[PDB]
Protein backbone atom coordinates (compact mmCIF):
# COMPACT_ATOMS: atom_id res chain seq x y z
CA UNK A 1 0.00 0.00 0.00
CA UNK A 2 1.40 3.29 0.51
CA UNK A 3 2.45 1.33 4.05
CA UNK A 4 2.67 4.46 6.72
CA UNK A 5 4.20 4.18 10.17
CA UNK A 6 3.82 5.96 13.19
CA UNK A 7 6.10 7.62 15.38
CA UNK A 8 8.45 8.47 12.77
CA UNK A 9 10.81 9.07 15.92
CA UNK A 10 10.08 8.61 19.91
CA UNK A 11 12.50 8.45 22.98
CA UNK A 12 11.19 7.35 25.88
CA UNK A 13 11.82 6.38 29.62
CA UNK A 14 12.82 2.60 30.58
CA UNK A 15 9.41 1.14 31.88
CA UNK A 16 6.80 2.77 29.68
CA UNK A 17 4.13 0.74 27.54
CA UNK A 18 4.94 1.77 23.82
CA UNK A 19 2.75 1.50 20.84
CA UNK A 20 3.92 1.76 17.20
CA UNK A 21 0.91 1.51 14.28
CA UNK A 22 1.13 0.29 10.82
CA UNK A 23 -1.53 1.05 8.64
CA UNK A 24 -1.78 -0.04 4.89
CA UNK A 25 -4.47 0.93 2.23
CA UNK A 26 -3.65 -1.86 -0.20
CA UNK A 27 -5.40 -4.56 2.29
CA UNK A 28 -2.88 -7.51 1.89
CA UNK A 29 -3.48 -10.52 3.89
CA UNK A 30 0.19 -10.36 5.46
CA UNK A 31 1.91 -7.51 7.82
CA UNK A 32 4.55 -8.16 9.67
CA UNK A 33 7.03 -6.07 12.22
CA UNK A 34 10.59 -6.26 11.89
CA UNK A 35 13.54 -4.53 13.79
CA UNK A 36 16.91 -3.42 12.57
CA UNK A 37 19.91 -3.48 14.33
CA UNK A 38 23.78 -2.38 13.17
CA UNK A 39 25.57 -6.07 12.03
CA UNK A 40 22.00 -7.79 12.72
CA UNK A 41 19.92 -7.19 9.60
CA UNK A 42 16.31 -7.61 9.63
CA UNK A 43 14.89 -9.49 12.71
CA UNK A 44 11.54 -10.50 12.37
CA UNK A 45 9.64 -9.75 15.51
CA UNK A 46 5.58 -11.27 14.63
CA UNK A 47 3.77 -11.70 11.62
CA UNK A 48 -0.02 -11.82 10.58
CA UNK A 49 -1.77 -13.38 7.87
CA UNK A 50 -5.42 -12.30 8.70
CA UNK A 51 -7.18 -10.25 11.57
CA UNK A 52 -7.37 -13.53 13.39
CA UNK A 53 -3.84 -14.48 12.80
CA UNK A 54 -0.35 -13.99 15.38
CA UNK A 55 2.78 -15.66 14.73
CA UNK A 56 6.14 -15.51 16.60
CA UNK A 57 9.34 -14.27 14.79
CA UNK A 58 12.56 -14.84 16.08
CA UNK A 59 13.18 -12.30 18.80
CA UNK A 60 9.39 -11.59 19.93
CA UNK A 61 10.40 -11.64 23.57
CA UNK A 62 9.24 -8.31 25.06
CA UNK A 63 6.76 -7.25 22.75
CA UNK A 64 2.70 -7.92 22.08
CA UNK A 65 1.52 -7.06 18.37
CA UNK A 66 -2.45 -7.32 17.81
CA UNK A 67 -4.26 -7.16 14.48
CA UNK A 68 -7.04 -4.79 14.43
CA UNK A 69 -7.85 -4.44 11.42
CA UNK A 70 -7.30 -5.90 7.71
CA UNK A 71 -5.21 -2.28 7.31
CA UNK A 72 -3.63 -2.48 10.64
CA UNK A 73 -1.13 -4.02 12.71
CA UNK A 74 0.28 -2.94 16.39
CA UNK A 75 3.20 -3.21 17.58
CA UNK A 76 3.39 -3.08 21.33
CA UNK A 77 6.58 -2.73 23.99
CA UNK A 78 5.30 -4.06 26.94
CA UNK A 79 7.73 -2.44 29.47
CA UNK A 80 10.57 -0.52 27.31
CA UNK A 81 14.17 -2.00 28.36
CA UNK A 82 17.58 -0.03 26.56
CA UNK A 83 18.50 -2.66 24.22
CA UNK A 84 14.74 -2.21 22.64
CA UNK A 85 16.66 0.73 21.15
CA UNK A 86 16.01 0.22 17.46
CA UNK A 87 14.64 1.01 14.07
CA UNK A 88 11.70 -0.91 13.37
CA UNK A 89 10.17 -1.84 9.93
CA UNK A 90 6.31 -2.10 9.33
CA UNK A 91 6.04 -4.33 5.75
CA UNK A 92 2.71 -5.91 4.01
CA UNK A 93 3.33 -8.76 1.43
CA UNK A 94 1.17 -9.68 -1.51
CA UNK A 95 0.71 -13.92 -2.26
CA UNK A 96 4.33 -13.61 -4.13
CA UNK A 97 6.73 -11.86 -1.63
CA UNK A 98 5.93 -8.52 -2.72
CA UNK A 99 6.95 -6.64 0.07
CA UNK A 100 6.32 -3.16 0.75
CA UNK A 101 8.47 -1.64 3.84
CA UNK A 102 7.00 1.31 5.61
CA UNK A 103 9.70 3.56 6.37
CA UNK A 104 10.83 3.45 9.22
CA UNK A 105 10.45 4.03 13.31
CA UNK A 106 13.73 5.16 15.22
CA UNK A 107 13.11 4.91 18.88
CA UNK A 108 15.47 5.45 21.65
CA UNK A 109 14.66 4.04 25.06
CA UNK A 110 16.65 5.53 27.93
CA UNK A 111 16.90 4.46 31.31
CA UNK A 112 17.13 8.05 32.89
CA UNK A 113 15.24 11.60 30.99
CA UNK A 114 17.63 13.47 33.32
CA UNK A 115 20.25 12.61 31.14
CA UNK A 116 19.00 14.25 27.70
CA UNK A 117 21.03 16.91 26.50
CA UNK A 118 20.89 18.85 23.40
CA UNK A 119 24.37 20.12 21.34
CA UNK A 120 26.66 22.54 21.17
CA UNK A 121 27.25 23.07 18.00
CA UNK A 122 30.66 25.16 16.71
CA UNK A 123 31.95 25.63 13.17
CA UNK A 124 35.87 25.73 12.32
CA UNK A 125 36.77 28.09 9.53
CA UNK A 126 39.06 26.99 7.11
CA UNK A 127 42.97 27.14 7.46
CA UNK A 128 45.18 29.72 5.50
CA UNK A 129 47.55 27.17 4.98
CA UNK A 130 44.91 24.83 3.47
CA UNK A 131 43.85 27.74 1.08
CA UNK A 132 47.23 28.56 -0.01
CA UNK A 133 48.44 25.07 -0.16
CA UNK A 134 44.91 23.49 -2.73
CA UNK A 135 43.24 26.08 -3.13
CA UNK A 136 40.02 24.35 -1.51
CA UNK A 137 38.67 25.03 1.87
CA UNK A 138 37.22 22.98 4.60
CA UNK A 139 34.73 24.11 6.79
CA UNK A 140 34.41 21.59 9.92
CA UNK A 141 31.24 21.33 12.04
CA UNK A 142 31.07 19.71 15.93
CA UNK A 143 28.28 18.64 17.62
CA UNK A 144 29.13 17.74 21.34
CA UNK A 145 27.61 17.24 24.33
CA UNK A 146 24.44 15.27 22.99
CA UNK A 147 22.39 12.75 24.39
CA UNK A 148 20.69 10.44 23.43
CA UNK A 149 22.41 9.50 20.00
CA UNK A 150 19.52 10.62 17.91
CA UNK A 151 20.18 13.44 15.83
CA UNK A 152 20.56 14.70 11.87
CA UNK A 153 23.50 16.83 10.63
CA UNK A 154 22.52 19.24 7.92
CA UNK A 155 24.53 21.84 6.12
CA UNK A 156 23.30 25.16 4.17
CA UNK A 157 24.62 27.67 1.86
CA UNK A 158 22.76 30.94 1.30
CA UNK A 159 20.20 29.49 2.61
CA UNK A 160 19.75 25.98 0.80
CA UNK A 161 20.36 22.15 1.72
CA UNK A 162 23.96 21.01 0.28
CA UNK A 163 25.13 17.64 -0.68
CA UNK A 164 27.98 18.25 -2.50
CA UNK A 165 31.39 18.47 -0.49
CA UNK A 166 30.00 16.85 2.38
CA UNK A 167 30.88 14.04 4.33
CA UNK A 168 29.70 13.67 8.44
CA UNK A 169 30.60 10.95 10.57
CA UNK A 170 28.00 7.92 10.20
CA UNK A 171 28.56 7.33 14.11
CA UNK A 172 29.19 9.82 16.89
CA UNK A 173 31.59 9.44 19.10
CA UNK A 174 31.34 8.62 22.99
CA UNK A 175 32.49 11.50 25.08
CA UNK A 176 33.47 9.19 27.92
CA UNK A 177 33.44 6.01 26.48
CA UNK A 178 33.15 4.23 30.13
CA UNK A 179 30.12 4.86 31.25
CA UNK A 180 26.69 3.48 29.85
CA UNK A 181 25.07 7.21 29.72
CA UNK A 182 27.71 9.02 28.16
CA UNK A 183 27.23 12.07 25.92
CA UNK A 184 28.28 12.06 22.50
CA UNK A 185 29.67 13.58 19.58
CA UNK A 186 29.95 14.35 15.86
CA UNK A 187 31.60 15.88 12.93
CA UNK A 188 31.16 17.10 9.19
CA UNK A 189 33.28 18.26 6.96
CA UNK A 190 32.25 20.82 3.97
CA UNK A 191 34.67 21.31 1.36
CA UNK A 192 34.30 24.39 -1.18
CA UNK A 193 36.83 25.90 -3.58
CA UNK A 194 38.62 28.27 -1.64
CA UNK A 195 37.03 31.17 -4.05
CA UNK A 196 33.89 30.72 -2.90
CA UNK A 197 34.87 30.81 1.22
CA UNK A 198 36.45 33.86 -0.28
CA UNK A 199 33.56 36.04 -0.87
CA UNK A 200 31.97 37.48 2.35
CA UNK A 201 28.46 37.48 0.55
CA UNK A 202 28.30 33.57 1.28
CA UNK A 203 27.18 32.14 4.23
CA UNK A 204 27.28 28.88 6.03
CA UNK A 205 25.41 26.92 8.77
CA UNK A 206 26.04 23.53 10.18
CA UNK A 207 21.99 22.75 11.35
CA UNK A 208 21.99 19.38 13.95
CA UNK A 209 18.45 18.23 14.38
CA UNK A 210 18.51 16.64 18.04
CA UNK A 211 15.30 14.71 19.29
CA UNK A 212 14.66 14.98 23.08
CA UNK A 213 11.74 15.57 25.21
CA UNK A 214 8.30 16.62 24.42
CA UNK A 215 6.32 19.50 25.76
CA UNK A 216 4.58 16.70 28.07
CA UNK A 217 7.99 15.30 29.81
CA UNK A 218 7.88 16.65 33.48
CA UNK A 219 11.72 18.62 33.77
CA UNK A 220 13.09 19.21 37.12
CA UNK A 221 16.47 20.55 36.88
CA UNK A 222 17.69 24.26 36.47
CA UNK A 223 19.34 23.87 33.24
CA UNK A 224 16.99 24.51 29.67
CA UNK A 225 14.41 21.86 29.30
CA UNK A 226 16.22 19.35 26.27
CA UNK A 227 13.34 19.08 23.70
CA UNK A 228 13.80 18.32 20.85
CA UNK A 229 15.54 21.30 18.29
CA UNK A 230 17.51 22.23 15.80
CA UNK A 231 20.85 23.37 17.26
CA UNK A 232 22.98 25.53 14.32
CA UNK A 233 26.70 27.06 14.13
CA UNK A 234 27.42 29.68 11.51
CA UNK A 235 30.09 31.18 9.73
CA UNK A 236 30.45 33.61 6.78
CA UNK A 237 33.24 33.79 3.71
CA UNK A 238 36.07 36.66 4.03
CA UNK A 239 38.65 37.86 1.77
CA UNK A 240 41.22 37.68 4.35
CA UNK B 1 13.85 -22.43 3.82
CA UNK B 2 16.19 -21.53 6.94
CA UNK B 3 19.28 -19.07 6.61
CA UNK B 4 21.14 -17.22 4.56
CA UNK B 5 24.80 -16.05 4.89
CA UNK B 6 26.46 -12.94 3.70
CA UNK B 7 30.31 -12.71 4.11
CA UNK B 8 32.28 -9.46 5.65
CA UNK B 9 29.99 -6.44 7.65
CA UNK B 10 32.16 -4.35 5.79
CA UNK B 11 34.00 -4.44 2.69
CA UNK B 12 35.88 -2.20 0.22
CA UNK B 13 35.81 -1.97 -3.91
CA UNK B 14 38.03 0.37 -5.47
CA UNK B 15 36.04 3.53 -7.56
CA UNK B 16 35.74 1.77 -11.06
CA UNK B 17 36.69 -1.74 -10.19
CA UNK B 18 34.09 -4.75 -10.27
CA UNK B 19 31.22 -4.81 -7.29
CA UNK B 20 30.82 -8.43 -6.00
CA UNK B 21 28.54 -8.47 -2.61
CA UNK B 22 28.51 -12.31 -1.61
CA UNK B 23 25.36 -14.12 -0.51
CA UNK B 24 24.89 -17.95 0.12
CA UNK B 25 21.38 -19.76 1.32
CA UNK B 26 20.73 -23.27 2.70
CA UNK B 27 17.41 -24.67 1.89
CA UNK B 28 16.82 -27.82 -0.07
CA UNK B 29 14.76 -26.43 -2.66
CA UNK B 30 15.57 -23.35 -4.64
CA UNK B 31 14.03 -20.24 -2.82
CA UNK B 32 13.43 -16.98 -4.26
CA UNK B 33 16.16 -14.62 -3.07
CA UNK B 34 16.11 -10.93 -2.61
CA UNK B 35 18.86 -8.12 -2.41
CA UNK B 36 17.97 -4.84 -0.81
CA UNK B 37 19.96 -1.41 -0.62
CA UNK B 38 19.89 1.33 2.23
CA UNK B 39 21.63 3.97 1.77
CA UNK B 40 22.47 6.19 5.01
CA UNK B 41 19.38 8.11 6.37
CA UNK B 42 16.82 5.74 4.69
CA UNK B 43 14.69 3.00 4.04
CA UNK B 44 15.58 -0.39 2.04
CA UNK B 45 14.77 -0.17 -1.65
CA UNK B 46 14.88 -3.87 -3.44
CA UNK B 47 17.78 -3.68 -6.30
CA UNK B 48 16.43 -7.41 -7.77
CA UNK B 49 14.90 -10.70 -6.79
CA UNK B 50 15.05 -14.46 -8.10
CA UNK B 51 11.95 -15.63 -8.73
CA UNK B 52 12.54 -18.49 -10.57
CA UNK B 53 12.27 -17.34 -13.53
CA UNK B 54 15.65 -16.25 -15.49
CA UNK B 55 18.65 -17.22 -13.45
CA UNK B 56 20.41 -14.20 -14.76
CA UNK B 57 18.37 -11.26 -12.68
CA UNK B 58 19.44 -7.81 -13.51
CA UNK B 59 18.18 -5.12 -11.72
CA UNK B 60 18.02 -1.32 -11.59
CA UNK B 61 21.70 0.16 -12.40
CA UNK B 62 23.78 -2.30 -13.77
CA UNK B 63 23.18 -4.29 -10.93
CA UNK B 64 23.13 -7.99 -11.74
CA UNK B 65 22.88 -11.77 -9.41
CA UNK B 66 23.40 -15.07 -10.93
CA UNK B 67 21.47 -17.84 -9.21
CA UNK B 68 23.58 -20.81 -8.86
CA UNK B 69 22.09 -23.60 -7.18
CA UNK B 70 24.77 -25.92 -7.14
CA UNK B 71 27.05 -23.54 -5.32
CA UNK B 72 24.29 -22.15 -3.24
CA UNK B 73 24.90 -18.63 -4.50
CA UNK B 74 23.42 -15.48 -5.55
CA UNK B 75 25.99 -12.70 -5.35
CA UNK B 76 25.28 -9.19 -6.37
CA UNK B 77 27.58 -7.67 -8.81
CA UNK B 78 28.00 -4.37 -10.72
CA UNK B 79 30.55 -3.93 -13.34
CA UNK B 80 32.15 -0.51 -11.53
CA UNK B 81 31.72 0.97 -8.62
CA UNK B 82 31.00 4.57 -8.29
CA UNK B 83 31.07 7.05 -5.07
CA UNK B 84 27.49 6.73 -5.10
CA UNK B 85 27.28 2.69 -4.57
CA UNK B 86 28.29 3.41 -0.86
CA UNK B 87 25.43 1.95 1.20
CA UNK B 88 24.45 -1.04 2.95
CA UNK B 89 23.20 -4.50 0.96
CA UNK B 90 20.71 -6.88 2.22
CA UNK B 91 20.55 -10.76 0.52
CA UNK B 92 17.26 -12.17 1.39
CA UNK B 93 15.31 -15.64 0.84
CA UNK B 94 12.13 -16.68 1.09
CA UNK B 95 10.90 -18.86 4.48
CA UNK B 96 8.66 -21.22 5.76
CA UNK B 97 6.59 -20.06 2.63
CA UNK B 98 5.39 -17.45 4.63
CA UNK B 99 8.06 -14.42 4.87
CA UNK B 100 11.09 -12.85 4.05
CA UNK B 101 14.40 -13.46 6.22
CA UNK B 102 17.37 -11.10 6.01
CA UNK B 103 20.97 -11.61 5.50
CA UNK B 104 23.10 -9.29 8.21
CA UNK B 105 24.02 -7.11 5.95
CA UNK B 106 27.10 -5.64 4.61
CA UNK B 107 28.17 -1.85 4.10
CA UNK B 108 30.23 -1.24 0.73
CA UNK B 109 32.89 1.34 1.00
CA UNK B 110 34.40 2.53 -1.97
CA UNK B 111 37.95 3.86 -2.20
CA UNK B 112 38.23 6.72 -4.75
CA UNK B 113 40.75 6.69 -7.12
CA UNK B 114 43.36 9.54 -5.54
CA UNK B 115 45.57 9.90 -8.18
CA UNK B 116 47.55 13.36 -6.73
CA UNK B 117 47.77 12.31 -3.16
CA UNK B 118 48.63 15.96 -1.24
CA UNK B 119 48.34 14.42 2.34
CA UNK B 120 48.44 17.35 5.56
CA UNK B 121 47.77 18.54 8.88
CA UNK B 122 45.63 21.55 9.29
CA UNK B 123 44.50 23.80 12.07
CA UNK B 124 41.24 24.74 11.82
CA UNK B 125 39.53 27.79 14.49
CA UNK B 126 36.10 28.37 15.69
CA UNK B 127 34.35 31.45 13.69
CA UNK B 128 33.17 32.85 17.47
CA UNK B 129 36.43 32.60 19.20
CA UNK B 130 40.18 31.63 17.89
CA UNK B 131 41.21 29.98 21.29
CA UNK B 132 38.92 26.96 20.51
CA UNK B 133 40.23 24.37 17.21
CA UNK B 134 40.41 21.41 15.77
CA UNK B 135 42.98 19.47 13.56
CA UNK B 136 41.80 18.11 9.95
CA UNK B 137 43.95 15.45 8.03
CA UNK B 138 43.34 15.75 5.03
CA UNK B 139 44.32 13.93 1.29
CA UNK B 140 45.76 11.41 1.90
CA UNK B 141 45.00 8.12 -0.26
CA UNK B 142 43.93 4.98 0.01
CA UNK B 143 47.20 3.27 1.66
CA UNK B 144 46.88 5.37 4.65
CA UNK B 145 44.09 4.86 7.51
CA UNK B 146 43.70 6.49 10.64
CA UNK B 147 43.82 4.94 14.01
CA UNK B 148 41.80 5.52 17.19
CA UNK B 149 42.96 7.65 20.06
CA UNK B 150 45.79 6.89 22.26
CA UNK B 151 44.53 9.21 25.18
CA UNK B 152 41.05 9.58 26.25
CA UNK B 153 41.06 13.11 26.10
CA UNK B 154 41.89 13.27 22.81
CA UNK B 155 39.39 12.66 19.94
CA UNK B 156 39.50 11.62 16.49
CA UNK B 157 37.15 10.46 13.94
CA UNK B 158 37.47 7.63 11.25
CA UNK B 159 38.30 8.61 8.23
CA UNK B 160 35.67 10.22 5.67
CA UNK B 161 34.89 10.99 1.99
CA UNK B 162 33.63 13.93 0.39
CA UNK B 163 32.89 14.28 -3.16
CA UNK B 164 33.06 17.78 -3.99
CA UNK B 165 30.57 17.66 -7.25
CA UNK B 166 31.78 21.48 -8.38
CA UNK B 167 35.51 20.01 -9.04
CA UNK B 168 34.68 16.43 -9.16
CA UNK B 169 37.27 15.93 -6.71
CA UNK B 170 36.90 13.83 -3.89
CA UNK B 171 38.79 13.57 -0.56
CA UNK B 172 39.66 11.66 2.72
CA UNK B 173 40.13 13.27 5.78
CA UNK B 174 39.27 12.70 10.08
CA UNK B 175 38.93 15.27 12.35
CA UNK B 176 40.97 15.17 16.07
CA UNK B 177 40.19 17.53 18.79
CA UNK B 178 40.76 17.82 22.76
CA UNK B 179 40.03 20.38 25.46
CA UNK B 180 43.48 20.10 26.58
CA UNK B 181 46.13 22.89 26.74
CA UNK B 182 48.87 20.35 26.10
CA UNK B 183 47.06 19.60 22.56
CA UNK B 184 48.85 20.47 19.50
CA UNK B 185 47.84 19.52 15.23
CA UNK B 186 51.51 17.97 14.82
CA UNK B 187 50.70 15.61 17.83
CA UNK B 188 47.13 14.96 16.97
CA UNK B 189 47.57 11.64 14.47
CA UNK B 190 51.31 10.38 16.29
CA UNK B 191 48.82 7.25 17.12
CA UNK B 192 48.42 7.10 13.06
CA UNK B 193 50.67 5.51 10.27
CA UNK B 194 50.67 8.72 8.53
CA UNK B 195 52.50 9.24 4.65
CA UNK B 196 56.15 10.46 5.28
CA UNK B 197 55.50 13.52 3.45
CA UNK B 198 52.16 14.43 4.91
CA UNK B 199 52.70 18.70 4.89
CA UNK B 200 53.07 20.20 8.54
CA UNK B 201 52.35 24.29 7.97
CA UNK B 202 53.87 26.24 10.73
Known amino acids: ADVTQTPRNRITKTGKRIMLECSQT?????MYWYRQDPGLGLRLIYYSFDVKDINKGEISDGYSVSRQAQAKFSLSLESAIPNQTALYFC??????????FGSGTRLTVVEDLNKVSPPEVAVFEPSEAEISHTQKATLVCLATGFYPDHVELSWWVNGKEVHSGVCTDPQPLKEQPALNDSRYSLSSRLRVSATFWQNPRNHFRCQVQFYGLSENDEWTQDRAKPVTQIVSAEAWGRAD | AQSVTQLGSHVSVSEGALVLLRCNYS??????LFWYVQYPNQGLQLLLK??????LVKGINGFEAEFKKSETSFHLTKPSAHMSDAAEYFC??????????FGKGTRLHILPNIQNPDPAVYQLRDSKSSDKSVCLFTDFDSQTNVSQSKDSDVYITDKCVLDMRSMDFKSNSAVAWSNKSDFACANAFNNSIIPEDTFFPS
Open chain 2, 92 to 101: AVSEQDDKII
Open chain 2, 27 to 32: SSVPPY
Open chain 2, 50 to 55: YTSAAT
Open chain 1, 91 to 100: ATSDESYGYT
Open chain 1, 26 to 30: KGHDR
